[PDB]
Subunit: 130 residues, 8 copies
């Protein structure tokens, strides 16, 4: 297909939601190629909105998948390295798909000199940085 | 099974809370598949919260699991590498399951130039 | 071909936007070499912006590419290492092509000493 | 045991305090399984309080243990990798068991443009971010 | 050449702009050695300005080059390691050549205690840090 | 030996202060086991402080130790890996024994967009 | 020696200043053992002051040394790993010996939402965090 | 040669400025050893500054050197590892020789909870 087809768009969203990657999805019988999907996306806001929802679901599916890829890795040096790569790629991607949920988490205890208060001295501007 | 049902949602939760993963929960007869679980969660806020605490409980189980995976690793190159991957994946996941508890911890001592006060100029 | 020409610049863009890299675009008959493309960009602001969105579109294509490179890696030491390099290079590049979208994501919970309020003294 | 048993809870706390991991503890003769311990924990505040103290002690014990795991590692490639994993897992866990004591430590010397003062310009809100 | 030669300076800028490294450029027929280029740079502002432009272009060229070095790496352990080194060296250098464009990119979602507001308590100075 | 006793607590301290680890101190005849040492510390604030300075003194000894471990490493793959683990463990531990002294050190030059002033809007 | 000996203290400072490590220095003919040096340090402020100066010089010497350790490494897998360890250990130590000179260096370009101004909303305290 | 002498100090500088390392400068006949160079620097502020610019010039030479070391690395495991160590050491050193130029570069987009404004409560 080249023409926008909502039925097909819907199927894409469903498959993505389950965790399948776009390139893999576009290899399925009857699917548009990736370039076409991106073009559909550019011109059809209904698809874009559904795609955003599919992306959120996709991330949640991948978050479960990473346990399985690690746990089921074949105990062979190269196969373990590949599992690691598949997992690391997913971890990186998850933070971009849903930054609020899957971004890094840090708690910073902020203290000042010698563990006391943070010491701040304010002055008038000394150069023209306006 | 596709139609949202509490008690089923309550069941899954209790199952996760006891340490069981969502994949295994969904591979049980009568259990909705992963897609259906997520759909539910998305459309039901009460299940979202309850699932969230199951998720926190699950994290506490996984926390103890990583010690076992590390300590009991088979002393062979590929098995140790696999154990490290299993542990690293869990560590990363734990921070997302309970950010306040399992997120990174840093104490930053903030000082100014040469260890003096922090110098600020305001326009 | 050295003289700046829209529609040619529009062409390159559309080509990048569809996922094609600048090297391949420039290795096409009639296409300006890389140096000439950059010269154009530098002296024409309208091409700079248009190229910038081609660049963002290109990033979205590369994002999907990294899954394929990782998942389809040949299970051999050197090939897996090469796949990892291809992926790491793309991940790094993506952040620069669209910083707001593909940059690192951190949530920092900022607290004060012993988890109390952040203590500040001002002069 | 399934029913809450303070005597057993107390023994768990003692063993944990000495650095032993929960899963290992639950393998000892007569111990409840991990799921049960977690259930005891959920319903009994007396156990939760004692468990928090045991967790603090556990971390202090592990902090000493890491030197030994490294120093005593068998000089074999795989055995060294495993020691490293056991150590790295403990380092990560310690920061979560007692963030104030075992979290990362950084001193940030904060300066501004060209090593001068930090330059700040304040303006009225330009959008409705309230 | 030892004496400053604008024609030669111009050629250097052109080659650098295309992504070639200075040391490699200075190995070309008729080129000054690196020390001389640096001396030309120190004394001739016209060259310095053109060199800054060449450095910006150089970075943009290298940014494309890294894909090729990775993608075309010979699938041999040592050759992959070398490609990685060539790539990592370029990534590091790019951020220094154009920090605004090629520096690291981070989005920090800043929150306070327990996910609420950031809690700040101000006090009068308690020591003489003026 | 379980009952808290100064001079014994003073002894342990002096022992740690001289570089000796708590494991070795506790493996000496007449010495309380690790559990008992910690119990003491927890219930006695004076021992807590004194032990804290023994800990800082111990850190200074370990600091010099890491040079020796690195420089004198046996030039064999597994031994070098073990030496690196011994050193990395010590480096990590040093930061916790004396955060102000052995913590990470960063100088952050803070600037605003495009290297201009930091732009803030306040509501 | 056990008794404090300024002549010996001075020699220690000289050797340290040149980059030699304390443990190595204490192996030299006639030197006190490390424990003794630390005890001398604790009780003699004149030695402490000279030792601080020696530590600064030591770091500057080590900063040059790292180039040599890397550049001269025997091209053998294990020997390269050891050189790396010797170098990494020195890099870490340098930042602690002189944090201002040898600490990490970062320039943070701080911007706000969507690349605009940093958006801050202040409110009255909502809990008693005083 | 131990007594501080300008022109000698000027010489060393010019030598460093041209890319030569302090070790080589000091291994030249008539040149003070490293200890003496440092002593000088410590007691003479004018030499400190001049040496500082030699150091910045040296950094610019090393910057170009790392490309050569990486690109011309012998395609053998141990040689590539050695080249990587030589490069990593230089990269680390460059940041200390000229922090403003060769330090790390980060752009932090600072936002508040859920991407809204940064929320602050003041006491």
């Amino acid at each position: 297909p080249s023409d926008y087809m909502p039925e097909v768009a819907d199927d894409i969203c469903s498959l993505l939601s389950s965790g399948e990657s776009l390139l893999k999805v576009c290899k399925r019988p009857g699917m548009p190629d990736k370039s076409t999907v991106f073009r559909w996306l550019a011109k059809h806001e209904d698809f874009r909105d559904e795609y955003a929802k599919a992306t959120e679901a996709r991330a949640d599916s991948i978050f479960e998948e990473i346990f399985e890829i690690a746990d089921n890795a074949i105990p062979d040096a190269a196969e373990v390295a590949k599992a690691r790569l598949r997992v690391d790629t997913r971890k990186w991607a998850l933070a971009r798909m849903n930054p609020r949920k899957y971004g890094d988490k840090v708690t910073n205890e902020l203290v000042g000199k010698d563990g006391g208060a943070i010491q701040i001295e304010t002055s008038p501007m000394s150069t023209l940085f306006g």
